[PDB]
Structure formats: C-alpha cells, structure tokens
Symmetry: D3
Subunit: 151 residues, 6 copies
C-alpha cells in the first residue's frame, strides 16, 4: 500500500518557539499520513551528512552546529506528491519570500532561523529518511479516512 | 441592497472528514452573508444536472455517483464578488495546484476528493442555486455590521 | 444503526455575530454526527410552540419575537449521550454561570442573548426535532471514523 | 534544574482522528517541556505491562489488544506538577465526565475511545517512562523562555 | 450606555511568550468592548505590559472567571491561566478583583483621555 | 539591536468586527516585536483605532505582505485582508509602505516615550 514519502524536521528554533504541534497539525489536516517520528538531539556530524551537498557554502559549518544545538523532531510523512507538496506548505527557503499561509510565511523571518526542513526531491527524501530513521522506526498502517482522501 | 450570490457545497469527503464548520467559519470571517443552507444526500439525477456541462468528461459518471454517495452541505452565500472570491478561497480545481491558505491548499490532496464546490460564474450560480434551493428556502436579512464590510 | 439525537439551534445573535461554523466545528470535533440541518427564518408562532412550556414566563413574548427576528440554523446532532453532552458543551442557560471552554462561556454574556439552544432531555429533543424537521430532512449515513469514536 | 516528568500517549484513535498536533500544541502552549517522543505500534506484551495494575478488570484484555492495534505517539513531558496537571488537561477517565476545555471534553465520547493516556502519579510515570523509553532516547535541554514560565 | 469596566493587564511573561493577541481575541470573542489600551514599562517592571480597560455587563467578575484562579495549578482548562501557564509568579495576566479595585486601577493606569467612548454596532446582539 | 520599525493600525472596521487580537496574534506568531501600542480616536475618525509599532528585520515590506494587497479582492487567502474582508474602503488594517513613511507615521502617532525598548528572550531563535 505504499505511497511516496518525505523527510520533515522541526528545527531547533521550531522546538524552542513551541511550534511542533502546529506544524504536525498542518500535515494531518492536509491528509498526509505520519509514517515515522522521533525526537532527538542530533550530532553535528549527522547534520554534516544531511546537508552534505552544501559542504562548501559559507553558512554550512554554522548551519550544522546550529541544527545540533537543540532537539529536533524528525518525521517521515507519506502521501501522493508529499515531497513537493510539503515544500509548498513550508514556503521558500527564505521566509522573506514565503507567502502568508505557509509555515515559514506565518511563523518566521530569517533564512538561518526558518523553523522547518523538508526533502527537496524523492531521491533526497530516500537518503534523508535512511539517514535519520532505522527501517523498523517506519510504521505501516492505514488511515481509516483514506477513502475520503484518495479515490 | 441585494448583492451577488454563489452556490457552495461541502462535498461528501468534506462532511466525512469533519470540515463543515471550518469551511463555514472561513466564509463568515471573510464577511460574506449566508443566504441559504440545507443538508441532503442528493439524487444522482440532480448531480448529473448540476454537472451537466461536464457530461462527456471521462470522470463525469464517477463524479455524479460519488457526489451522491453521502450527505453534502448545500449553501447560498451573498456578497460583492462572492462568485470569483469564493473560488479564490477554495483554491484551484486540483488541490495540487492550490496554495496554502486556501481550503483545498490546507485540507486535501486529490482532484477527486477536493472537499468543496463553488459556482464558476454568476450564470452558473443562478442555475445551481435554483437547482438546489426553492425560492421559499432562501433567506434575506441584513448583517448588523454590514456597514463595516461595505462602504 | 440509530443513536440518540438532539435538536441544536444557532440563535439569531449567533448568526449575526458570525459563530455558525465555530459552533458546528465544536460538535464535529467532539465526534458527534450531523443528521439534519437547515437555515430558516422561523415564524414567531413556531417559536411559541418550541418554547411552549415557558408561555407564562415574563420573557416569553420577547424571547419568541427575538428568535424570529433573524435567521437561525436548525440542527439535529446524533451520538451516544448527545442530549446531555451538548448542554454541557453549551454551558448553563446564563452565560454568566457558564465556564470558559463552553460555547456560552467563550462567546456571550447575557441570558437573553445566549447564542445557542439545545434540547434539555430526550423527550424534549424528540418533540423539537419533529417540530423543526420533516422526517425526510433527517439524513441517515455512517461516519467512516465511527470505529474510532465508538468501540 | 530537573523538573517532574510524566508519560503521555496519543492513543490509536487519537492518531487515526488526526489529533496528534492538537494534543502536542496544548502541552507546548501550557509551558511544559518535551523530553521524549517516539511513534510506534506497540507490542501487546508491552501494553499488558503498561496496564498491569488493571489486569483483572473485564476491559483489560480488550484494552491491551486495542492499544496495540495501531501506532501511538509516546511522549515524555517535563515541568512542575506535570503529572497531575496533564491529567487535568486531558479530563476525567470517562469523556462523559470531562469538561469542555479538556482534551477528552472537546474531542471524544466513550471511555474506550478516549484518545489519550497520562500517568496517574510520579511513581507510575517513572515506571511508564522507563518502559517506553531507553535512557539514551530522553532529551535534556533548556527552554530559552523557561524564566518566563518559572520564577 | 456606559457599562461596568475592569482593568486587565498582560504581564511581562504574557508579552514575552507572545500571548497578547490570544488574550485580546478571547475578550473580543466574549463580546466585551475594548475601552482603553496602552503598552508601557511601568515604574513586574521587568519589561513591557499591555494595560487595558474592558467594558460590559459584569466584566469585573467575568474577566476573573475567564482568567482562571490566581494560581494556574487551580485554574481549569479553557481559562487563560489554565491553558497557558504553570506558576503563580508567572501567571501572565491580571484582572481587577472588584468594581472598586477596577475604578482605582483604571484611574491609576489610564488618563481620562485614554478611555475611548464608542458603541459596538453588534451591541444589540450581545445586550438585550 | 534596534531593528527596522513600521506603523500598523487596526482600522475602525477592524476594531468593530473584533479582529484586533487576531491581527496582533499574527504579528506575534511571525516573530516580530511589539514596540508600541495605543488606542485612540484620531482627529477614518469614525471610531477607535489600534495604533502599533512593530519591529524586526524587513518588517515594513513583510507586514505589507502579511496584510495582502491594498484591495482585498486582490489579496490572497492566508493574508489578513484575504481572510477577513471584501472592499477597498473597508480593508481593516494599515501598514507603512516604506521605511521613510514608517518613520514619519511612527513620529506622528507615537511620542518617543511610547516606544518601549526591550528584548524578546527568544530573539536568538528568530535572528541569527
Ligand atoms: N544564504 C543562506 N544563509 C544562511 N543560511 C542558509 C542560506 N541558505 C540556506 N540556508 C540554510 O540551510 C538550510 C538548507 O539549505 P537548502 O537545502 O538550500 O534549502 P531548503 O531547506 O529549502 O532545502 C536552509 O533551510 C537554511 O536554514
Ligand atoms: N480530472 C479529473 N478527474 C476527476 N475528477 C475531476 C477532474 N477534474 C475535475 N474533477 C471533479 O469534477 C469537479 C467539477 O469540475 P470543474 O467544474 O471542472 O471544476 P471546479 O470544481 O473547480 O469547478 C471538480 O471539482 C473535481 O472534483
Ligand atoms: N430570566 C430570563 N430572562 C430572559 N431570558 C431568559 C431567562 N431565562 C431563560 N431565558 C431565555 O429563554 C431560553 C429558553 O429558556 P430555558 O429553556 O429555560 O433554558 P435553556 O435554553 O437552557 O433550555 C434561554 O436559552 C434564554 O435565551
Ligand atoms: N470501564 C471501562 N471500560 C473500558 N475501558 C476502560 C474502562 N475504564 C477505563 N478504560 C480504559 O482503560 C484506560 C486505563 O484506565 P485507567 O488507568 O483506569 O484510567 P486513566 O486512563 O484515566 O488512567 C482508560 O484510559 C480507558 O481507556
Ligand atoms: Mg538542500
Ligand atoms: Mg464546476
Ligand atoms: Mg426549556
Ligand atoms: Mg491509568
């Protein structure tokens, strides 16, 4: 019964500013299915791998330390088109360019404090999910209202 | 003053997923006036006429079938530019193309389970409202703060 | 498959103050099932019958005229214990004695403007539902998530 | 400073009815600190131990069976008086006796589908937290505005 | 008609934790009328407070009910202190405990210029 | 650090329709800092307005985005005008259109005493 998945994380600013439930609420209200979830303080080296494609960018060392500075909520969300749709729901990388109604549009201001992460593509999602989740931490179950979300 | 009216329906998935109140609340908040409301399981005959323009589309027979599967909330809403504005508030026909902040943007995933209907034009609204409501079932009244909504 | 029902109405102040959706939202969120709904401007004589047991009270003539002064949303809600549970959700007859968290506790101030009505007992509900609803206006359907509300 | 901790679980009906975010959001809003969170379909063995005190109750075997039917959200929350206060926020064991404003008061109907669990005491919390979480899975951190929550 | 009035303040912890709008929304939703509002660091004085005067039938006692008990521990869910805080020294909001207190507190915090006379157009749907 | 500041007013239709708290909650949620607040009938003057000064990086243009277009008809859902109103003459809120406008509007509506200097303790989670 399996459907596309993506990796979503509430960043340390999201946790510190009390937005975990508000963020999850939006993904539930959309009809997406929660397949995995954990709360951790990730190591700086874990984040260096998560953001490996950015290793040469000037903000990278500070981004990885920052993302390891507090707990994060790591999540796997599942549904048709969830990878691209979640990005839409978050807004742009820069909150300044994110529209009201989006998570970043509604809740934050700066690119370095943009509360949330979502995979940018299916292949990125597959890598990120495997990096953060062990296979047994991914739950298979079926939403009773699946009939009303998918024909 | 009598203003423009549109026909809005909460589809069976919208009723089943408990979004009636949320949808009505968005229209009240916007400033529009409720002019008619009933709750029915519509006949397939009625829906075939409702969607008569799409009678040759592949999805037509399934659409009408599905829209008559359960109760819907049928509404008439009144206010300046309410036809085009209600459509903006719902989003695009496909939720995948709808923006966060809109009803479909926030709440659903698939074009076949897109929780709500709105007339696409004034002429469409005139036909639909007459199809769903008897004249005696429409309510004319004046919002006390209508002067804070309209100059 | 039938379960207890009650009659709930959004009074004219509830409609005028934009609380229809907020009220319905609360009954949906609770797990109750919407069985019937209509929007009407009820006659003063209909209300005189609705409130017949109060015919000798000083506020009665003014209460019946008032309740016929604007549109009301008439509803039948269904579920285990719904009659008594809905009253709890509304608060006391007097908003002054209704606790925050209740509909009257949150949204109004005076006994004569207390936004909502609910049947006080099963026998009252049976009478009120029959007075306001024709039998065909009552919808039989089954909430897909009934399994998660009732064991 | 290390403060009191409690074990809180979103039950399978709570997950299925899309109330994860809403529940977490209430605990964040109150000022409590998230100290642990995982998402699992628990073994029936684990639940039999979780509820071991109720092993002779008629509802016990069905309870454990049901709690292992789907994924639950397992949580550790931290703060002054969090054990007794979390229980207040959920309501009474039976939703019928729970007040509007509480989680069960707002969201459910039956004692067997009462969406959430909280430890009934500190000693119960110590056992439950150890049963559901390995030491390495609990997160110690400091809320930046903790000084606006505690003097 | 000028109705009963009470003093309500969002305390510095209320301002710091971003609860100003949430508190105001509750009093507006209830049907009470905002009569006065300012934002000041008074000369507790650990930061800005929102000082307010709300007006309506029985607003003094009702606003206290809406806040919850003095201690959040004794405050019920649905109330402001019940939903949003934990400790007695960090209980986010203040409300006058009587008409006399209210009258004194209003006079202390507000100049008469700062109490605005107006009528909610929906007043006839709130007050008989 | 003193950051950029803009003038925002809840218009009389905004006050009359009970949207003050809702508007404030949006600016608090976004992470902007309330710098000044009053409530007055200015000498449009058809009733009370809530006058505010909000502070943060890019607050002038961002607050305009949060409001939506000048006309609610062109305002998108999610925005204040998009969610809550219909006509251009009843568009509930005002925001300065530039830093220069903001500076002038703030000076016009607020005395320097009424701009409170403070720091959100969560500032380090909003600003790098
Ligand atoms: N110019 C920048 N300055 C500081 N931080 C940045 C910048 N660009 C990106 N970041 C941070 O790095 C994270 C990952 O970057 P990237 O993968 O490019 O964006 P996204 O999160 O949209 O996929 C961003 O979410 C943001 O927190
Ligand atoms: N390609 C499609 N496949 C399935 N159902 C569709 C498709 N396109 C439209 N529908 C359904 O038919 C309904 C009516 O179509 P249409 O009138 O074109 O759109 P709208 O609802 O936006 O007015 C849509 O709301 C949608 O639920
Ligand atoms: N003392 C009173 N003064 C004015 N109106 C009243 C009074 N008591 C009751 N009412 C109005 O009459 C309605 C019906 O009264 P009743 O059936 O006694 O209360 P309830 O609505 O709780 O069943 C109330 O909801 C209220 O609007
Ligand atoms: N009489 C009952 N019938 C069915 N299930 C029950 C009954 N009483 C309790 N339960 C279930 O067992 C759970 C555990 O019981 P208990 O520990 O007594 O209550 P609480 O959950 O409030 O701590 C309850 O939350 C409820 O879901
Ligand atoms: Mg990237
Ligand atoms: Mg169409
Ligand atoms: Mg009665
Ligand atoms: Mg127990």
């Amino acid at each position: 019964m399996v459907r596309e998945r993506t990796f979503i994380a509430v960043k340390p600013d999201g946790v510190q500013r009390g937005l975990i439930g508000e963020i999850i609420k939006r993904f539930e209200a959309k009809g997406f299915k929660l397949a995995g979830m954990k709360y951790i303080q990730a190591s700086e080296d874990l984040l260096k791998q998560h953001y490996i494609d950015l290793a040469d960018k000037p903000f990278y060392p500070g981004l990885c330390k920052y993302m390891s500075s507090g707990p994060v909520v790591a999540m796997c969300w599942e549904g048709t088109g969830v990878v691209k749709t979640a990005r839409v729901m978050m807004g742009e990388t820069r909150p300044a360019d994110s529209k009201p109604g989006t998570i970043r549009g509604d809740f934050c201001i700066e690119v370095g404090r943009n509360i949330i992460h979502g995979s940018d593509s299916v292949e990125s999602a597959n890598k990120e999910i495997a990096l953060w989740f062990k296979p047994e931490e991914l739950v298979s179950w079926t939403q009773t209202n699946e009939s009303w979300i998918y024909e």
